[PDB]
């Protein structure tokens, strides 16, 4: 029976040695896939180690029974058990460390992939945001302006969510304690900055297009007014006072708009203003 | 406090703006220098991004990131001022590339009062800029890239 204990203890020792040096691995995953495979394999190996714990406890129980019974070799036996307990504890640690490492390498691969797809997506949205296309007439600019508004909105909505998700994820890693938290943080900072830049680029593009719309809206309105002056000329008391108000507005728009332009373009604005004024005077 | 991340609007009323991320990085568009509302972008790009980074002689080195001002190709009616911060025997040279494939050297003083076209802005002395390590690039147009180097 003590003779039997020794064999059992030697057997447990050999099993521990085998798991520690030969079953568990130091291999380092090259990629997410490789990591998933290694992790899956590692977790089963670790369940095996935990499961062996039953064997060890039972052996202690026997070493304790053999000691308390006053066996001649009770001191020798209780020592071997201490050595086994120790070696087993060493193996559980090594397994847990490995698990901690694989989870870190894995998660990081996921985050890196998700950050990259997102940064690329942002880069793509920026090109659309950089378009110079100003549009040839009023209907064309109306089109671009309306199309870009839809784009600004779809981009704002989808992007903010994706940004939020990468942020929440990055935070979860750091909160659970990750070996690479300093590097992950630089990624968050880089990503958040790009997002802000995209939202600003989107916004200036929109301001550009609003200004372009205003310029074309003015010329369009001038044309309408000339036709309206002409229509009345060829032609009631109230209608003219009202067309008169419409003219006064056009006059205000022309001055406001003038401050923004210079040279050829600014003059075109003035020419059209005077043309309208002259036509209006002819009527009165 | 109106600074920019990467762009801002400006019209013929002129306008002056500083990078909100980088105060030293300054863009001055004086009154009457562009014909219409223009959307100015100014982005600092890492060298590693170009297909043709500026060719480097033996003791030569970059002193700033690549600077992309937009829109590429834009012509102004007179000159505009862009101040770029840079990092600390040898000499500062601004280089520009019209389309990203060829780099050439770019290069005022008494012009300052003139080119501002009446703008109430307090430009620094060239000596104050050297202390703070900023370069003043005066240009009437934007090439794709400008960079600051030392030879």
Swiss-Prot record, chain A:
Spectrin is the major constituent of the cytoskeletal network underlying the erythrocyte plasma membrane. It associates with band 4.1 and actin to form the cytoskeletal superstructure of the erythrocyte plasma membrane. This is Spectrin beta chain, erythrocytic. It is linked to Elliptocytosis 3: A Rhesus-unlinked form of hereditary elliptocytosis, a genetically heterogeneous hematologic disorder characterized by variable hemolytic anemia and elliptical or oval red cell shape. Inheritance can be autosomal dominant or autosomal recessive. Belongs to the spectrin family. Transmembrane segments: none annotated. It is found in: Cytoplasm, Cytoskeleton; Cytoplasm, Cell cortex. The chain holds residues 1585 to 1889 of 2137 of the full protein. Spectrin repeats lie at residues 1-104, 106-209, 213-284. The lineage of its organism: Eukaryota, Metazoa, Chordata, Craniata, Vertebrata. It comes from the Eukaryota. Composed of nonhomologous chains, alpha and beta, which aggregate to form dimers, tetramers, and higher polymers. Interacts with BCAM. (Microbial infection) Probably cleaved by P.falciparum SERA6; the cleavage results in SPTB solubilization causing the disruption of the actin cytoskeleton and the rupture of the erythrocyte cell membrane releasing the merozoites. This complex is anchored to the cytoplasmic face of the plasma membrane via another protein, ankyrin, which binds to beta-spectrin and mediates the binding of the whole complex to a transmembrane protein band 3. The interaction of erythrocyte spectrin with other proteins through specific binding domains lead to the formation of an extensive subplasmalemmal meshwork which is thought to be responsible for the maintenance of the biconcave shape of human erythrocytes, for the regulation of plasma membrane components and for the maintenance of the lipid asymmetry of the plasma membrane.
Curated annotation (Swiss-Prot), chain B:
Regulated by phosphorylation. Palmitoylated. Residues 4-151 form the ZU5 domain. The modification Phosphothreonine is found at residue 52. Isoform Mu17, isoform Mu18, isoform Mu19 and isoform Mu20 are expressed in skeletal muscle. Isoform Br21 is expressed in brain. Signal peptide: none annotated. It is linked to Spherocytosis 1: A form of spherocytosis, a hematologic disorder leading to chronic hemolytic anemia and characterized by numerous abnormally shaped erythrocytes which are generally spheroidal. SPH1 is characterized by severe hemolytic anemia. Inheritance can be autosomal dominant or autosomal recessive. Patients with homozygous mutations have a more severe disorder. Component of the ankyrin-1 complex, a multiprotein complex involved in the stability and shape of the erythrocyte membrane. Attaches integral membrane proteins to cytoskeletal elements; binds to the erythrocyte membrane protein band 4.2, to Na-K ATPase, to the lymphocyte membrane protein GP85, and to the cytoskeletal proteins fodrin, tubulin, vimentin and desmin. Erythrocyte ankyrins also link spectrin (beta chain) to the cytoplasmic domain of the erythrocytes anion exchange protein; they retain most or all of these binding functions. The 55 kDa regulatory domain is involved in regulating binding of SPTB/spectrin (beta chain) and SLC4A1/erythrocyte membrane protein band 3. The ANK repeat region forms a spiral around a large central cavity and is involved in binding of ion transporters. Adopts a T-shaped arrangement, in the ankyrin-1 complex, in which ANK 1-5 repeats are orthogonal to ANK 6-24 repeats, with the peptide binding groove of ANK 1-5 repeats oriented toward the membrane. The rearrangement of the ANK 1-5 repeats orients the canonical protein binding groove to directly face the membrane, to interact the membrane-embedded targets RHCE and AQP1. Component of the ankyrin-1 complex in the erythrocyte, composed of ANK1, RHCE, RHAG, SLC4A1, EPB42, GYPA, GYPB and AQP1. Interacts with a number of integral membrane proteins and cytoskeletal proteins. Interacts (via N-terminus) with SPTB/spectrin (beta chain). Also interacts with TTN/titin. Isoform Mu17 interacts with OBSCN isoform 3/obscurin. Interacts with HIF1AN. Interacts (via ANK 1-5 repeats) with RHCE; this interaction mediates the primary membrane attachment site for ANK1. Interacts (via ANK 1-2 repeats) with AQP1 (via the N-terminal). Interacts (via ANK 1-13 repeats) with EPB42. This is Ankyrin-1. It comes from Homo sapiens (Human). The gene is ANK1.
